[PDB]
Amino acid sequence: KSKLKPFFALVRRTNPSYGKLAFALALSVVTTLVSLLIPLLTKQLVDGFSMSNLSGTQIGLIALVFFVQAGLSAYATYALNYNGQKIISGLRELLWKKLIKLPVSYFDTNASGETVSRVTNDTMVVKELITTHISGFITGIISVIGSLTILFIMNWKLTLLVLVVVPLAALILVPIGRKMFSISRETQDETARFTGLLNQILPEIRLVKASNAEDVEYGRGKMGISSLFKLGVREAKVQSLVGPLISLVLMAALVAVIGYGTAGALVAFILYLFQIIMPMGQITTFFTQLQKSIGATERMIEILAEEEEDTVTGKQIENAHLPIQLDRVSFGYKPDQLILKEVSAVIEAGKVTAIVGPSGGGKTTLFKLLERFYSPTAGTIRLGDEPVDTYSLESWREHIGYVSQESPLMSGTIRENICYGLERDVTDAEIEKAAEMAYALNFIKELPNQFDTEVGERGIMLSGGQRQRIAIARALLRNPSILMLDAATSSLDSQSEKSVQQALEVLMEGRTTIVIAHRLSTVVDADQLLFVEKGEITGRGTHHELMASHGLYRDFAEQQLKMNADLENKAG
Amino acid sequence: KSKLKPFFALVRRTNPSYGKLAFALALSVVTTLVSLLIPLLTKQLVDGFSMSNLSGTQIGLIALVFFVQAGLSAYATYALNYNGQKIISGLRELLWKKLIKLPVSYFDTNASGETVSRVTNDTMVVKELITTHISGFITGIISVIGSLTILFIMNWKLTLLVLVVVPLAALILVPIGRKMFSISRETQDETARFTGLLNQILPEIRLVKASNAEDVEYGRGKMGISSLFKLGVREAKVQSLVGPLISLVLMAALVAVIGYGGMQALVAFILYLFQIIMPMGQITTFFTQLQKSIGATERMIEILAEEEEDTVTGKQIENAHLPIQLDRVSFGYKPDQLILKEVSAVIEAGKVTAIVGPSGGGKTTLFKLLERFYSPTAGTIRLGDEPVDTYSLESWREHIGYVSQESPLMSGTIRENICYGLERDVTDAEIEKAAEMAYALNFIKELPNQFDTEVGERGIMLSGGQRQRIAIARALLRNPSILMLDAATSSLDSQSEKSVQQALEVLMEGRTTIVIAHRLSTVVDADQLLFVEKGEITGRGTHHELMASHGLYRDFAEQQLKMNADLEN
Ligand SMILES: Nc1ncnc2c1ncn2[C@@H]1O[C@H](COP(=O)(O)OP(=O)(O)OP(=O)(O)O)[C@@H](O)[C@H]1O
Ligand SMILES: Nc1ncnc2c1ncn2[C@@H]1O[C@H](COP(=O)(O)OP(=O)(O)OP(=O)(O)O)[C@@H](O)[C@H]1O
Ligand SMILES: [Mg+2]
Ligand SMILES: [Mg+2]
């Protein structure tokens, strides 16, 4: 609740910080000791060196070493910074591993392109910190405890002033440190908004060439930056406010010396007291910059509490192959506004089931449900009269292939877009058979050499027709028990998909297959068919069995029949 | 060529840096003066102050006021940092405006998700810099010139040592500054690779749940970070190397005082000489961190030389409406491997032309050409017997609508996905007619209130079916002379698109329309049709005119006829 205890708990999860820093902090302490001891000895030494040269050859060597050991402080600056580079790299490690094992039901709410900078830019603020953080704080805290003990009159008999220098200053940093905390949470919640704007803009540059967007999306960037980030000077204004305020209470201690305070002691008293400031200007800098870190990490804390959606809790059950039964499952994408209404159907093995619905139904959502992404409230999904959750959470995903309604590809270099299914044993003499079972090898070999070809970002390299045929090979290399085709009519011609339908029939005969498609002439011979509508389903059986029996549509097909009856009489 | 002259030229383009910094640098100079003058006066003052409380009270209250002007240094630290915040914001301004006016023929080569961080993270390295950069450099350079003049014996009669302290140190920083420059260009060319990895991964999280990717794409991140960025400690190792090496030449000057002065003031000479180090430790820090900036900006320079693809060179010609003629245009996406082979066809006005080709042809690469993105080598594109380049470069884009083969949407809040065509005069009582002409208003009004609805990143809140119908409204709000539909069969059903075809026929009758589509039953009544194949075209005329006459395919249609003959029997 104190916003401080989790932060040291946060760096605690990066384990190996304790080892080398403990050595690294130690020699920086004695670095403060030798810098304490240096200016008093040389002024007596030179008087000592009036003798000069003799003491000098030997002491020249001595000083070189000594002065070489004055350069040993650089090794402390190195070794702190090395463990400084360790602690940031542990954050980026632990942030990234949590980031992909968390449920997909998070990412739909908040902006994948926003949270990505919270890996980078909400760590790099601790790199610049941890030099000024540690090294400045330790070098002062020994000097201030080194001051008042040698200011021995003022901590045993004149204590009533050295109990004013810290606590009255401590009241001053409290609104500053709180305001410093309310700023660093804002900028770091706006760097993420700023980078999130651009990654939702820059890959879509072909649309932003709409010739009126370029005068506008530039204007959104400037309104992104200058109204916020030059308005990030609000940090720097308060940052410079600390200057007078440390002194404005410190000189208040200085005027206090006449209210309570022989004369031979007063002159030495001023001499030691003015050695406090360059120490005191460091410790307050640390307490400022510390609260800068917290607001830059307070957002990063909450994304370490979301609940680890991939479990490997496989109880006794992964392997056998049984039919799939949906049992009154009703899904809500938002729990007060649901779109699926206790649908109940059975997916028998070895036979291609299909799903056909109009635009706006629950077609694709039932597929994302059948990857067990949500497993909603009312209803259970079972297989073999066994509930699908208790098998495992996502080792059951391994048995299934899946292609989306769109065709997604990462920064591919084509052969790696197909590869990571079996992920270790790709068997290069088999990918071409997965290409031949997808009509891919025909229009790949004329390109420069399948490996050597590189797709774009979202896969621009290849085009749109080649995109869909590439992604369908991903499911046909994983060799699944259960296929899941979402759009086999998406971006491909009738010449292609006839080879596709004639290919997977050799594959899938004891391996059941759920495929939805537009344009019902691709699922006419399916062994089952469904007609889903707005979260409800009103159909069963074969298409010929459904056309004569059911009287709901009776022209969904005839909407597509009359679009094809024109082609006969126009040709003959 | 010197890698330095463009950098000061780079900040020169951010104009207003000259104004306030000149005031800001000035009072920091006299801040160095008062810090020079302070420790000598007080030690003589306290002996005169011991003339009691009286000596202190009334002069000392001004000394508090004097100590308030010691806090005036903070205002210099502020005003430097304020102009420090100005110069970074000018970079992000000038980088962003150049970034979107440059040709699309750049972005296909290098990785939009890579170059985006070069807006942010290759500017923020100058923010931390410019405090340590300027303020540290100015506060030393006056002190070192303030030292040797008060070390007056050693710059007129013992000069032969103060001509060693700088130039022999200057040899030492040369490999360091060069190595420091070869490091900062690497990390900043790897922050961009690291962020570019994630934005090509994180929005595709539904695919990365392939259950074997999570154990792998996590491993690519760690191999991204730890093999490179904990290996970014190579900076910090050389960064700490400067410590001995400034002194290891400085004490070499110290041993030199007996080689020329030992046979011949010496006690006061040591006292002023040891005041040089905390100055000298600042100036070398500046020359280190300066070369850190250059490698973090050398990549940023070259993206200010690419050539401004939107010109507003409209010569005399924007407005009239004439047919479109392609004349032997041959496009290469790579100039030694071209895919379009001097295609020649004519697009007559008022009549829907279509294009149908198999997978792998040049069907869209002719649409992206028809937005004048490339305008390739062999051949000219003309309209009205007038070449299309000399009209304007992209004010001609305003007359045209266009939807892609995919359906793209930005972070929308639906009404803003349709809005920025006319971009100032959206006329809220008309968007619904642009929705009614796209079969959008039917399945929008049941959602929570068209404005209030928000799509996802790539429209993931909306459907796939709803995505395509939304994007097609964008062209039907701009009210074009020329439509360009790329996939009216993409993600939409036969119930939808029959309304779509029956809608735009009321719109397009004197407004010509180029539409490609799968599944030839949507272009059967087109007034012209083309059959493009691998960059070549082998068809003309009407479909019924092409089916009997041409003998190339003769079963491209029959490939789709026999798939529909099963539905009757
Ligand atoms: N936030 C959301 N997440 C997931 N699905 C949503 C969300 N909001 C709405 N939906 C619904 O998801 C449904 C299913 O989309 P689907 O996968 O069926 O697209 P499709 O298969 O192309 O079919 P359609 O043609 O009906 O869009 C849509 O009806 C849409 O209303
Ligand atoms: N970024 C790119 N720019 C231009 N051409 C590309 C690019 N990436 C790949 N290509 C090549 O351009 C060819 C043309 O594809 P096109 O633009 O016609 O897409 P398409 O209309 O979907 O093609 P099809 O419908 O024939 O599959 C592809 O075969 C591909 O080899
Ligand atoms: Mg889908
Ligand atoms: Mg296309």
User: 3-state class of A98 per DSSP?
Assistant: helix
Around Cβ A227, how many Cβ atoms within 10 Å?
Answer: 9
Rounded distance, CA B138 to CA B28, Å?
8
Show Cβ contacts of residue A565 under 8 Å, excluding neighbours closer than 6 positions: none
The answer, for A427 touching chain B at a CB cutoff of 8 Å, is no
Burial A354-363 (b: 16+ CB within 10 A, else e): bbbbbbbbbb
Same domain, A512 and A560: yes
Which of A74, A191, A77, A174 is closest to A130 using CA atoms?
A77
Q: Which residues contact A415 (CB under 8 A, 6 or more apart)?
A: A431, A450, A451
Q: Which residue has the tokens 């229009």?
A: A443
Looking at the 3D structure of chain A, how many domains does it have? 2
How far is Cα B178 from Cα B175, in angstroms, rounded to an integer? 5
Nearest to B514 by CA among B496, B498, B532, B499: B532
Minimum CA–CA partner of A77 in chain B: B240
SS (H, E, C) B139-206: HHHHHHHHHHHHCHHHCCCCHHHHCCCCHHHHHHHHHHHHHHHHHHHHHCCCHHHHHHHHHCCHHHHH
Which tokens sit at B131?
Answer: 């405090």
Indicate whether B234 and B269 sit together in one domain: yes
Which residue of chain B is at minimal alpha-carbon distance from A234?
A: B82
Interchain CB distance below 8 Å, A199 and B498: no
DSSP state of A306: S
Are B285 and B340 within one domain?
Answer: no
Beta-bridged to residue A356, according to DSSP, are A531
Ligand with the closest atom to the CA of B491 = 1
- Residue A566's domain spans which residues? 312-572
Cβ atoms of A206 and A237 closer than 8 Å: no
Amino acid at A425: D
CA A571 to chain centre: 58
Q: How far is the CA of B366 from the centre of ligand 4 (A)?
A: 9
Report the CATH number at residue A354.
Answer: 3.40.50.300
Cα–Cα distance measured from residue B270 to residue B251, given in angstroms and rounded to the nearest whole number: 12
First vs last C-alpha separation in chain A? 82
Tokens for B513? Answer: 């329309």
| Cβ–Cβ under 8 Å, residues B324 and B346 | yes
Which of B294, B36, B68 has the alpha carbon at shortest distance from B180? Answer: B294
Residue B526 contacts residue B543 (beta carbons within 8 Å): yes
Asked if residue A324 and residue A251 are part of one domain, the reply reads no
Q: Distance between CA B271 and CA B492 in Å, rounded? A: 87
DSSP B388: G
Q: Write out the H or E segment, with its range, that includes residue A501.
A: helix A494-507
User: Which of B43, B36, B405, A462 has the alpha carbon at shortest distance from A473?
Assistant: A462
Nearest-angstrom CA–CA distance, B396 and B317: 9
> Which candidate in A199, A220, A496 is best for mutational testing of the B interface (most B CBs within 10 A)?
A199
Q: What secondary structure, in 3-state letters, does B267-302 show?
A: HHHHHHHHHHHHHHHHHHHHHHHHHHHHHCCHHHHH
Tokens of B190: 């790897």
How many helices (H) does chain B have, and how many strands (E)? 25, 9
Per-residue buried b or exposed e for A125-161, using 16+ beta carbons within 10 Å of the residue's own CB: bbbebbeebbbbbbbbbbbbebbbeebeebeeebeeb
User: CA of A244: how far to CAs of A173, A237, A247, A258, B330, in Å?
Assistant: 12, 13, 5, 22, 71
Write down the residue that tokens 């000592």 correspond to. Answer: A48
Q: Which ligand is nearest to the CA of A404?
A: 3
Tell me how far apart the alpha carbons of residues A536 and A344 are, in angstroms, rounded to a whole number. Answer: 9
| Six token digits for residue A357 | 């619905």
**Residue A543, token pair as written in the block:** 């298409």
DSSP state at residue A113: H
Nearest ligand 2 atom to the CA of B405 is 22
My answer on whether B316 and B297 are in the same domain is: no
> How far does Cα A226 stand from its chain's mean position?
26
Which of B311, B337, B361 is the C-terminal boundary of a domain? B311
In angstroms, the CA A468 to CA A516 distance is: 15
Which structure tokens are listed for B478? Answer: 């701009």
Strands B483-485 and B513-516: parallel
A174 burial level (CB within 10 Å; 0-12, 13-18, 19+): exposed
CB A73 within 8 A of CB A29: no
Q: Cα(B103)–Cα(B101) distance, rounded to whole angstroms? A: 7
Residues B298 and B413 in one domain: no
| B461 contacts A100? CB cut-off 8 A | no
For chain B, positions 14-33, list CB contacts with chain A under 8 A: none
Task: Kindly state whether residues B60 and B147 are assigned to the same domain.
Answer: yes
Q: DSSP characters for B468-528?
A: HHHHHHHHTTS--SBEEES-TTSS--HHHHHHHHHHHHHH-SSS-EEEE-SSGGGSTT-SE
Mutate to test the interface with B, among A212, A237, A374 (most CBs of B within 10 A): A212
Token pair for A400: 């299934």
- Cβ-contact B310, B332 below 8 angstroms: no
CA A263/CA B214 separation, integer angstroms: 76
Mutate to test the pocket of ligand 2, among A444, A462, A463, A466 (most ligand atoms within 8 A of CB): A463
Residue B382, CA distances (Å) to A118, A340, A391, B368 in order = 50, 53, 64, 16
Q: Are residues B277 and B417 in the same domain?
A: no
Residue A59: list chain B partners with CB under 8 A: none
CA-to-CA distance for A413 and A30, rounded, in angstroms? 55
A 55-74 → B contacts, CB under 8 A? 56, 60, 63-64, 67-68, 70-71, 73-74
Q: B528-533 and B513-516: which strand pairing?
A: unpaired
Query: Domain ends where: B311, B328, B361?
Result: B311
Beta strand A536-537 pairing with A528-533: antiparallel
Token pair 């000598």: residue: B40
- Indicate the resolution in Å: 3.9
Which three-class secondary structure state does DSSP give residue B334? strand
Strand order in the sheet with A528-533: A483-485, A513-516, A352-356, A528-533, A536-537
Fill in the DSSP letter of residue A203: G
Closest CA to B440 of B416, B414, B461: B414
Which residue's structure tokens are 């060529």? B1
**A231 Cβ partners below 8 Å, 6+ apart?**
none
For chain A, state the CA radius of gyration. 36
CB A163 within 8 A of CB B77: no
Q: How far apart are CA B222 and CA B218, in angstroms?
A: 6
Q: Do B218 and A98 meet the contact criterion of CB atoms below 8 Å apart? A: no
Residues 175-204 of A with CB under 8 A from B: 191, 194-204
Tell me the β-bridge partners of B337: B334
Residues B305 and B323 in one domain: no
Total length of chain B: 569
Give kind and range of the element (H or E) at residue A325. strand A324-330
Q: How far apart are CA B91 and CA B13, in angstroms?
A: 9
Query: Solved how?
Result: cryo-EM
Interface contact A408-B204, CB threshold 8 A: yes
- Residue B553 CA to residue A250 CA, distance in Å, equals 93
C-alpha span between A89 and A109 (Å, rounded): 28
- Alpha-carbon distance of B504 to B506, in angstroms, equals 5
Q: What is the rounded CA–CA span in Å between residue A510 and residue B344?
A: 51
The radius of gyration of chain B from alpha carbons, rounded to an integer in Å, stands at 35
Q: Could you tell me where the DSSP H helices lie in B229-378?
A: 233-255, 257-260, 266-273, 277-295, 298-302, 364-370
Cα of A406 from ligand 3 centre, angstroms? 7
Q: Residues enclosing ligand 2, CB less than 6 A?
A: A 456, 460-466, 491; B 108, 333, 339, 357, 359-365, 405
Strand A513-516 vs strand A352-356: parallel, antiparallel, or unpaired?
parallel
Instruction: Residue A117: name the closest of B208, B301, B194 by CA.
Output: B194
Q: d(Cα A351, Cα A195) in Å, to the nearest integer? A: 48
CA distance A508 to chain B (A): 20
- Asked if A271 and A356 sit in the same domain, the reply is no
In this structure, which residue's CA is closest to atom 5 in ligand 2?
B333
Helix then strand then coil, % of chain B, to nearest 5: 55, 10, 40
Ligand 2 atom with least separation from CA of A464: 22
For chain A, give the number of residues. 572
Dist. CA A246–CA A168, nearest whole Å: 10
d(CA A388, CA A375): 9
Nearest CA to B463 out of A367, A411, A199, A471 is that of A367
Which residues have CB less than 5 Å away from ligand 4 (the ion)?
B 364, 405, 486
Within 8 A of B490 by CB-CB distance, chain A residues are 490-491
3-state helix, strand, coil in chain A (%, to 5): 55, 10, 40
Q: Which whole-number Å values give the CA distances from A488 to A287, A403, B314, in the listed order?
A: 61, 10, 45
Contacts of A505 (CB under 8 A, 6+ apart): none
**Residue B356 CA, ligand 2 centroid: distance in Å:** 14
Query: In this structure, are B48 and B121 located in the same domain?
Result: yes
Tell me the β-bridge partners of B382. Answer: B325, B387
**Strand-strand pairing, B378-383 and B386-387:** antiparallel
| Alpha carbons B519 and A549: distance in angstroms, whole number | 29
Residue B118 in 3-state DSSP?
helix
Q: How far is the CA of A405 from the centre of ligand 3 (A)?
A: 4
Return the SS3 of A287.
helix
Last residue of a domain, one of B269, B286, B311: B311
- A308 φ/ψ angles, rounded to the nearest 5 degrees: 35, 60
Joined together, the tokens standing for residue A84 give 């400084």
Are B7 and B111 part of one and the same domain?
Answer: yes
- Of A256, A268, A248, the closest CA to residue B64 belongs to A248
What's the distance, CA A309 to chain centroid? Answer: 15
Name which of A334, A398, A326 is nearest A367 in CA terms.
Answer: A326
**CB neighbour list of residue B193: distance below 8 Å, 6 or more residues apart:** B114, B224
Long-range CB contact pairs, A556-560, < 8 A, 24+: A556/A356, A556/A520, A556/A531, A556/B494, A556/B495, A557/A520, A557/B567, A559/B494, A559/B495, A559/B498, A560/A519, A560/A520, A560/A521, A560/B494, A560/B567
Distance CA A259, CA A239 (A): 33
Mapping DSSP onto H, E and C, the string for B426-468 reads: CCCCCHHHHHHCCCCCCCCCCCCCCCCCCCCCCCCCCCCHHHH
